[PDB]
């Protein structure tokens, strides 16, 4: 047979780790994205881009080390090592923050190579591609938060850094500046993820608890072989449970397991639609008539207007040290503040 | 002070999709009743 | 002209009504007040 056919045999050779055609894209890019995150969090600074310390070498724990976004001085540049702002010179490419784009552009093709891997396994193993469909959610969250969100904002500075505390403030960045919990696209996302952990806890519990006696051991885990033709939990008994406890229960295993596919996945889509809202700053920030009536009645307070005062706490206090390049100098009489604290 | 066509956009955004999905249910119940010949045709 | 060898029945269960209504009514609880402002 041909040359390409022999190449096709040898990467599709069944061994301990399957390589595949997608593995020509996955295994270089997924190694470097995971490798560049480890080197950037152990050695490389934020000191010239954010003015922070973010590395295990400088003082950070696991919780505060981060591969950090470049400066706003660089715009949306790709920060190529050979590029016009690095010009080779790996030392200068790290201090400008080139590793963050290095991780984010190899994490992008690593996720492409991992979804393509789920198509390639599913063909040759001969099975329906619903893992590749269910993985398209985590692609959408990555692309919309780490790529589509900065590319509508001022530069790459506003995507979150790859680190534990550095994401934690991106939670509190989008709260203060963007009122991110109020976006109903995000509320559908929370319902999908909490409802997804709900279904993982339910279907785990009911299967373990409608099990059949298949042995005399008090341990029940050893009474299963994978080649069985029968069911190991009573679906009739499990339907009689929830229909009589909750009122409403499943009656298909096919509709159940699609529903466990569906709920976490469509949480991540509807949430990732709304983060393309803030990329271009179209956001559910205020209700108008709710905010009218407050400005004509000083009597009228809601929890909603309580949140706006907390939002201008985050907006005003953080921004002097949030964006250091824009050189916010805030007088202490300017800074909004309650009584005594 | 409250916005204006939202009284339209909610109630026509409820009822027109709600009444649509009713009728894919009314369609089958008639189709399953036309299948098994009973007192209804 | 002619009858098709394509045309088929379209179905929706009783539960799929209840999913489908409760989809529309609960999205109308969410996206109501944002439209009202």
């Amino acid at each position: 047979r041909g040359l390409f056919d022999l190449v096709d045999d040898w990467l599709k050779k069944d061994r301990f780790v399957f390589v595949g055609w997608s593995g020509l894209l996955l295994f270089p890019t997924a190694y470097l994205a995971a490798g560049g995150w480890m080197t950037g969090t152990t050695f490389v600074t934020s000191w010239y881009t954010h003015g922070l310390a973010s590395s295990y070498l400088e003082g950070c724990n696991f919780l505060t080390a981060a591969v950090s976004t470049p400066a706003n001085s660089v715009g949306h540049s790709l920060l190529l090592l050979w590029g016009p702002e690095a010009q080779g010179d790996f030392t200068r490419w790290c201090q400008i923050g080139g590793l963050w784009t290095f991780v984010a552009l190899h994490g992008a093709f690593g996720l492409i190579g991992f979804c393509l891997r789920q198509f390639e396994i599913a063909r040759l193993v001969g099975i329906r591609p619903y893992n590749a469909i269910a993985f398209s959610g985590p692609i959408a969250v990555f692309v919309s938060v780490f790529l589509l969100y900065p590319l509508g904002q001022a530069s790459w500075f506003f995507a979150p850094s790859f680190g534990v505390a550095a994401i934690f403030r991106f939670l509190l960045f989008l709260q203060g500046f963007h009122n991110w919990t109020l976006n109903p696209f995000h509320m559908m996302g929370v319902a999908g993820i909490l409802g997804g952990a709900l279904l993982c806890a339910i279907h785990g519990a009911t299967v373990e608890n409608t099990l059949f006696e298949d042995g005399d051991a008090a341990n029940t885990f050893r009474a299963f072989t994978p080649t069985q033709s029968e069911e190991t939990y009573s679906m009739v008994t499990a339907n009689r449970f929830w229909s009589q406890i909750f009122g409403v229960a499943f009656s298909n295993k096919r509709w159940l397991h699609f529903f466990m596919l569906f709920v976490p996945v469509t949480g991540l889509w509807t949430s990732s639609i709304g983060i393309v809202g803030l990329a271009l700053n179209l956001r559910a920030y205020d209700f108008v008539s709710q905010e009218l009536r407050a400005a004509e009645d000083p009597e009228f307070e809601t929890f909603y207007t309580k949140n706006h005062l907390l939002d201008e706490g985050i907006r005003a206090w953080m921004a002097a040290q949030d964006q250091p390049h824009e050189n916010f100098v805030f007088p202490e009489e300017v800074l909004p503040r309650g009584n005594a604290l | 002070e409250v916005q204006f066509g939202a009284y339209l956009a909610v109630l026509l955004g409820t009822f027109l999709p709600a009444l649509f999905l009713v009728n894919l249910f009314i369609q089958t119940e008639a189709r399953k009743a036309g299948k098994a010949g009973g007192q209804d045709s | 002209t002619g009858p098709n060898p394509n045309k088929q029945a379209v179905e929706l269960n009783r539960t799929s009504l209840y999913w489908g209504l409760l989809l529309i009514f609960v999205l109308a609880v969410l996206f109501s007040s944002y439209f009202f402002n």
């Binding site: 009739v236 | 409250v2 939202a6 109630l11 | 209504l21 009514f25 109308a28 009202f36």
Partner: peptide, 30 residues
């Protein structure tokens, strides 16, 4: 007048849940 629309939809969901529990399509063993 939008508190009408709010309570119509909240009671609207509460009605749909009532029909979904007590008027459900029962599953049969057959």
């Amino acid at each position: 007048m939008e508190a009408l629309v709010y309570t119509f939809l909240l009671i609207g969901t509460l009605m749909v849940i009532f029909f979904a529990v007590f008027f459900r399509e029962t599953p049969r063993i057959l």
